[PDB]
Write a protein that binds this DNA or RNA. Structure first.
Lengths: 76, 129, 141, 83, 150
RNA sequence: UUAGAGUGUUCAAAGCAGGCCCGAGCCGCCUGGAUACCGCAGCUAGGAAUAAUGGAAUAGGACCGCGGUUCUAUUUUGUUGGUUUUCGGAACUGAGGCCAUGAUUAAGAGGGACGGCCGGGGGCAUUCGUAUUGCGCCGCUAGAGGUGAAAUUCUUGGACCGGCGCAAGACGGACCAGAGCGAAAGCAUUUGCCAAGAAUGUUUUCAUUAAUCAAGAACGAAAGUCGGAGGUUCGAAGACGAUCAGAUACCGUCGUAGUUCCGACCAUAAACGAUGCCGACCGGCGAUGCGGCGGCGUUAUUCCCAUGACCCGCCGGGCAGCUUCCGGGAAACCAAAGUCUUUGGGUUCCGGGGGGAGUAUGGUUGCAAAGCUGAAACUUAAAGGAAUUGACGGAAGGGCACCACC
RNA sequence: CUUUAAAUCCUUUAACGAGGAUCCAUUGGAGGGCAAGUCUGGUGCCAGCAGCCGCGGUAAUUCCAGCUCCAAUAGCGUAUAUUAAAGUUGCUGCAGUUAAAAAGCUCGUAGUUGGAUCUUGGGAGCGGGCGGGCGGUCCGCCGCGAGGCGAGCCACCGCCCGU
């Protein structure tokens, strides 16, 4: 999501292992992170690397350090 | 459609061994399947086979031999943390004295006795005895 | 005929968390309505006074008149029928006696010829019903 | 025990199987030449045609696509399988 | 088996093993590349262009004698269709049926076949949209669609 | 704490304790109280088979090349203090370069195009065939219908029968089959028209686009409901006549709803193959439908030729059949209900003894009928499937007997 | 006496302290499952027993008792919760034609699974090491210091087999 100004909402997929079966179970937990207001040109659906921080807000703890996907997208 | 292309090949020889034929052909081919049958041939469980080549896929012919009893496949491709390996070869094998289970590994595909010496693990493929 | 996948651990799990409910040996023991209708509060035994003494017949194949007691509990104030298991030990039971009642021996079911009675009597006014029979004790008169 | 070679079968059993079920699959058609009746500009034409062909040397139709194999209007020289 | 009507059909073509020039008629890629344009300009989908080159001209496969298949040729020059050749026809069948459907209302067979065909198209849109051939903001309407097609 | 090592708490459960050497002469010595296990998550570092995932396609990697702008200083006579250069780097910018210049194959996966067909596939119009009922006209007569037997019924107001026509509504007999198509319910008069579809045939195209499926959506026989038009036959309900002890049933004469048609609701059937979908493999055989192929003779033509119709075979996909100890199963049976303790191709729904019950209540859809979702209290020792022997049949096939008949 | 703030019990030495009821062993059974009586008296579909199948209406192997035997032995039955048995909750591991059981059929989003392919190949290469026939050797017998063998302590070498 590219909603409310100066912060974005990121899904985060990962696998949880059930002990009983020998099989995994997909989950996901999505969290808000601040942003550098330098940035337009941060599309959605693209990977990002995020770092920990002091509790910026009620639900804003992690903060964005560098975005990581532009080649699999449109014109140069 | 076809999903576990290892599974279909093994059932193709297993059903052909039960009848008593000498040769059998399997429809698809792969390194996973070629490196599989070589494990059997390295133990003498089968004869000597040929790998027809095309541009499409390749189709292996195998010269079966009356030495293997059953050639199963185990899916999904599990893990073997080398502490579960002794459980597997006791609830999936006829006995400890004979029969081997093949499990893929960071050092190639190899039957479990190889895994113990190279002291590693990895995902599991199938079994024969 | 199965899921058997490798990222399917949830479906194998929310299926068995669903089909367990059809195991009546489990639906009873894990649903609050099963214990609620138990005259005992799930207890092993339950005291309660005797409000009359009645006899009850036997089923078709063999005839008799099993002797019983209409014990009312004090825990819930319910009313239950209690078999008096012994040979002619309905002479020590009397009205307003506070007898001790136990499960009959089939975990909440009748047993044999007795129709609809799931409870037997172990003590009578704080003396053992076995003790009264063999005579070791004696109920003061 | 019905032990027969699936590697070296007769060149005549291979016609007793589908276009796909042979040892190494190969099309059942064959590219053929035609002498263009009345003229000497010899053109190529595919045996299992699904389209007509019209000859400036004839001004009349040459091959007629019917079913799954072509039928030629007038006989001509027919080379085959130079591929 | 098929995707919507049952039956494990099997009538597909079968390429030869030999990957060489026919060596009966070369007419090398300079001619063919500049030849396909005449057929593509005259108006023929890349599906039909292979026929006329195969049936009369004589070509094993355009991918053999020339460099690349009939779309990669038509991609560079600027003769790639507006819509992919399989999608364009699927809309035609979806449009003609809808035309017949607004007249013969109780023709329950068409009202069914239209449901399969709109499902085929919407499956191709959700595939092309990933491969960037079609823009993300594309949407099949069933009303604005007949204006795209003759 | 579990495991386990060392140790004689008299043994053990335990405990982390103890053993020497001598009166004691040393102004004491030797030691113990360890190890493994402790997922999942986080950190670290070797392995890179399998499984995700990535990279230059309308230009991108390479060559410390020669050019601009714009700036950030280190330190040289000015030790410090202000000014100009170059270098190094950083930002955008000018020509050609070395790329073997970058696009794996095209699946007995799939979509799509193409060609000749095929099919009681679907819709709309068109057309025919007898039959039934009604009626007009003419003929001859006294009975006609109907059942096991009759009667209600039909005629002295000429019925039933025979002939020529007229009107109506339904229905497609015989051809019609273990034959065809459709997802299933289902579909059979000639002709036309509209649009679709499987299968084959392909040295065409795209290059993974595909399998299965909660929530959701289209179709869903019969019956039933709502409005309009028609109502031949049959006909729930109804009134009668019979048989019966009763017969508000079977049987017979009438007969409303209904049956058929156009427009909407309803979403249920032993809607059955009581047998999920897709994919692979394991026996033979004679035929059947469609397509294409190879064929020697015949028949339609005066000519192989275009093509039918016969006749011999092959290949794919169908509906199905016969046989076999491949192999399963409780067995009847099964080329799937096989490849199942020698169990694991992928995926959906669903059952846990019988009854209470598919009931009560709650939610929800429905004009109504009802449909979907859906318990417990209590009760019970058996409910239930296949085969085997008998008994029995107002069940058929043979045969005998005056305790049977003629 | 010892133990311990103080006593208490075990431990150590005293004076007494066993002839069958002294110093007396039970709790549940004897139809089957399930070890052990087709023994005697009573009761007569009564009393009652019995987890279940079942016994009781004149000969009760089951009731009430006597005798004899059986189970566990300072413990043993009863009640209920619970685990194994349970392949009757089944991921290893269940079933669905008829025994309960597959939506009427199709489409289909979440969800699950997804064809093939990027040295699936060698060198008298170089060397270290396990066992192994080997050519050699320090080495061990043998020999006359002219000589004969390679495996058996020690292994070494160029080489092959053993994935």
């Amino acid at each position: 999501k590219m909603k409310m100004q100066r912060t974005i909402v990121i899904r985060r997929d990962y696998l949880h292992y059930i002990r009983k079966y020998n099989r995994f179970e997909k989950r996901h937990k999505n969290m808000s992170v601040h942003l550098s207001p330098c940035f337009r040109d941060v599309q959605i659906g693209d990977i990002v690397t995020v770092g920990e921080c002091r509790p910026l807000s009620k639900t804003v703890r992690f903060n964005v350090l560098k975005v990581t996907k532009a080649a699999g997208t449109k014109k140069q | 459609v076809r999903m576990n292309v290892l599974a279909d090949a093994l059932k193709s020889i297993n059903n052909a061994e039960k009848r008593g034929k000498r040769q059998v052909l399997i429809r698809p081919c792969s390194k996973v399947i070629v490196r599989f049958l070589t494990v059997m041939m390295k133990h003498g469980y089968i004869g000597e086979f040929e790998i027809i080549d095309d541009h499409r896929a390749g189709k292996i012919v195998v010269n079966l031999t009356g030495r293997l009893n059953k050639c199963g496949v185990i899916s999904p491709r599990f893990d073997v943390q080398l502490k579960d390996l002794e459980k597997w070869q006791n609830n999936l094998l006829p006995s400890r004295q004979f029969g081997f289970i093949v499990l893929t590994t960071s050092a190639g595909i190899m039957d479990h006795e190889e895994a113990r010496r190279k002291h590693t693990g990895g995902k599991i493929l199938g079994f024969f005895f | 005929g199965k899921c058997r996948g490798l990222r399917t651990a949830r479906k194998l799990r929310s299926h068995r968390r669903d089909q367990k409910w059809h195991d009546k040996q489990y639906k009873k023991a894990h649903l609050g309505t099963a214990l609620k209708a138990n005259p005992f509060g799930g207890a092993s035994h339950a005291k309660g006074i005797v409000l009359e003494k009645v006899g009850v017949e036997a089923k078709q194949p063999n005839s008799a008149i099993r002797k019983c007691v209409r014990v009312q509990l004090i825990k819930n104030g319910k009313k239950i029928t209690a078999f008096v298991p012994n040979d002619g030990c309905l002479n020590f039971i009397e009205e307003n006696d506070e007898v001790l009642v136990a499960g009959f021996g089939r975990k909440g079911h009748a047993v044999g010829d007795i129709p609809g009675v799931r409870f037997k009597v172990v003590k009578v006014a704080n003396v053992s019903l076995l003790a009264l029979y063999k005579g070791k004790k004696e109920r003061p008169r | 025990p019905l032990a027969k070679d699936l590697l070296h079968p007769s060149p005549e059993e291979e016609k007793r199987k589908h276009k796909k079920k042979r040892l190494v699959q190969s099309p059942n058609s064959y590219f053929m030449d035609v002498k263009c009746p009345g003229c000497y500009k010899i053109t190529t034409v595919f045996s299992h045609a699904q389209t007509v062909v019209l000859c400036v040397g004839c001004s009349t139709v040459l091959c007629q696509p019917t079913g799954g194999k072509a039928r030629l209007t007038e006989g001509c020289s027919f080379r085959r399988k130079q591929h | 088996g098929r995707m919507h009507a049952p039956g494990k059909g099997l009538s597909q073509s079968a390429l030869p093993y030999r990957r060489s020039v026919p060596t009966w008629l070369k007419l090398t890629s300079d001619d063919v590349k500049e030849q396909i344009y005449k057929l593509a300009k005259k108006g023929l989908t890349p599906s039909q262009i292979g026929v006329i080159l195969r049936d009369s001209h004589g070509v094993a496969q355009v991918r053999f004698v020339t460099g690349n298949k009939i779309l990669r040729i038509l991609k560079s020059k600027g003769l790639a269709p507006d819509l992919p050749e399989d999608l364009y026809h699927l809309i035609k069948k979806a449009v003609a049926v809808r035309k017949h459907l607004e007249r013969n209302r109780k023709d329950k067979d068409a009202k069914f076949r239209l449901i399969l065909i709109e499902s085929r198209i919407h499956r191709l849109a959700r595939y092309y949209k990933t491969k960037r051939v079609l823009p993300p903001n594309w949407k099949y309407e069933s009303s604005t669609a007949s204006a795209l097609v003759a």
